[PDB]
Design a protein around this motif. Structure first.
Motif, short mmCIF file in Angstrom:
data_model
loop_
_atom_site.label_atom_id
_atom_site.label_comp_id
_atom_site.label_asym_id
_atom_site.label_seq_id
_atom_site.Cartn_x
_atom_site.Cartn_y
_atom_site.Cartn_z
N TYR A 30 -4.72 16.99 16.04
CA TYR A 30 -4.20 15.85 16.79
C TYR A 30 -4.88 14.59 16.27
CZ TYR A 30 -3.15 12.52 20.49
OH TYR A 30 -2.75 11.40 21.19
N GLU A 31 -4.08 13.60 15.86
CA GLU A 31 -4.60 12.34 15.34
C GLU A 31 -4.56 11.29 16.44
OE1 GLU A 31 -2.44 9.86 12.77
OE2 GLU A 31 -4.18 9.16 11.63
N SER A 32 -5.70 10.63 16.66
CA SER A 32 -5.75 9.59 17.69
C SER A 32 -4.72 8.51 17.40
CB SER A 32 -7.15 8.97 17.76
OG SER A 32 -7.09 7.71 18.40
N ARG A 33 -3.98 8.12 18.44
CA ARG A 33 -2.98 7.07 18.33
C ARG A 33 -3.13 5.98 19.38
NH1 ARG A 33 1.39 7.63 15.20
NH2 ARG A 33 1.08 9.12 13.48
N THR A 34 -4.14 6.07 20.25
CA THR A 34 -4.35 5.04 21.26
C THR A 34 -5.81 4.60 21.24
OG1 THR A 34 -5.03 6.42 23.14
CG2 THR A 34 -2.68 6.29 22.66
N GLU A 35 -6.14 3.65 22.11
CA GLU A 35 -7.52 3.18 22.19
C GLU A 35 -8.44 4.19 22.86
OE1 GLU A 35 -8.46 0.60 20.66
OE2 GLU A 35 -6.53 -0.36 20.24
N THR A 36 -7.89 5.16 23.60
CA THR A 36 -8.71 6.01 24.45
C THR A 36 -8.56 7.51 24.21
OG1 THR A 36 -7.03 5.97 26.19
CG2 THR A 36 -8.77 4.30 26.33
N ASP A 37 -7.67 7.94 23.32
CA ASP A 37 -7.50 9.36 23.05
C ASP A 37 -8.48 9.82 21.97
OD1 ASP A 37 -6.37 8.26 20.76
OD2 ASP A 37 -4.47 9.34 20.92
N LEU A 38 -8.49 11.14 21.72
CA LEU A 38 -9.50 11.79 20.89
C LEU A 38 -8.82 12.55 19.77
CD1 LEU A 38 -12.25 13.07 20.14
CD2 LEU A 38 -11.89 14.75 21.96
N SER A 39 -9.17 12.22 18.53
CA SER A 39 -8.72 13.02 17.39
C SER A 39 -9.48 14.34 17.33
CB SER A 39 -8.94 12.25 16.09
OG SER A 39 -8.14 11.08 16.03
N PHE A 40 -8.77 15.41 17.00
CA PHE A 40 -9.43 16.69 16.79
C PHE A 40 -8.63 17.54 15.82
CE2 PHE A 40 -6.93 16.91 20.70
CZ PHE A 40 -6.07 17.96 20.44
N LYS A 41 -9.30 18.54 15.25
CA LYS A 41 -8.68 19.48 14.33
C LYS A 41 -8.49 20.84 14.98
CE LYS A 41 -8.63 16.66 10.78
NZ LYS A 41 -9.77 16.78 9.83
N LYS A 42 -7.45 21.54 14.54
CA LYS A 42 -7.27 22.95 14.84
C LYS A 42 -8.59 23.68 14.75
CE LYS A 42 -4.31 26.87 13.55
NZ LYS A 42 -3.06 27.25 12.82
N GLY A 43 -8.93 24.41 15.81
CA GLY A 43 -10.12 25.23 15.84
C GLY A 43 -11.31 24.60 16.52
N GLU A 44 -11.24 23.32 16.83
CA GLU A 44 -12.35 22.65 17.49
C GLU A 44 -12.52 23.14 18.92
OE1 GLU A 44 -12.93 18.42 17.53
OE2 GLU A 44 -12.13 18.21 15.50
N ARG A 45 -13.77 23.21 19.36
CA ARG A 45 -14.10 23.53 20.74
C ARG A 45 -14.26 22.24 21.54
NH1 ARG A 45 -15.69 28.02 23.59
NH2 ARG A 45 -17.83 27.22 23.76
#
Length: 59
Positions: free
Chosen positions: A11-26
């Protein structure tokens, strides 16, 4: 208590407040009401809102 999830998809961050993460992250929730959760990545140390339909429960 602690509530943790693992990412099924990138998931790539697209807002000021969301969180980018990769498949497999805890990720832990800082509860799971609704569809957008404030999370902390145990992997990356970053925080922000995540979409609940990208993750699945992880003990």
């Amino acid at each position: 208590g602690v509530t943790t999830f693992v990412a099924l998809y990138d998931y790539e961050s697209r807002t000021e407040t969301d969180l980018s993460f990769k498949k497999g992250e805890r990720l832990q929730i800082v509860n799971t009401e609704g569809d957008w959760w404030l999370a902390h990545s145990l992997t990356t140390g970053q925080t922000g809102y995540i979409p609940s339909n990208y993750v699945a429960p992880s003990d």
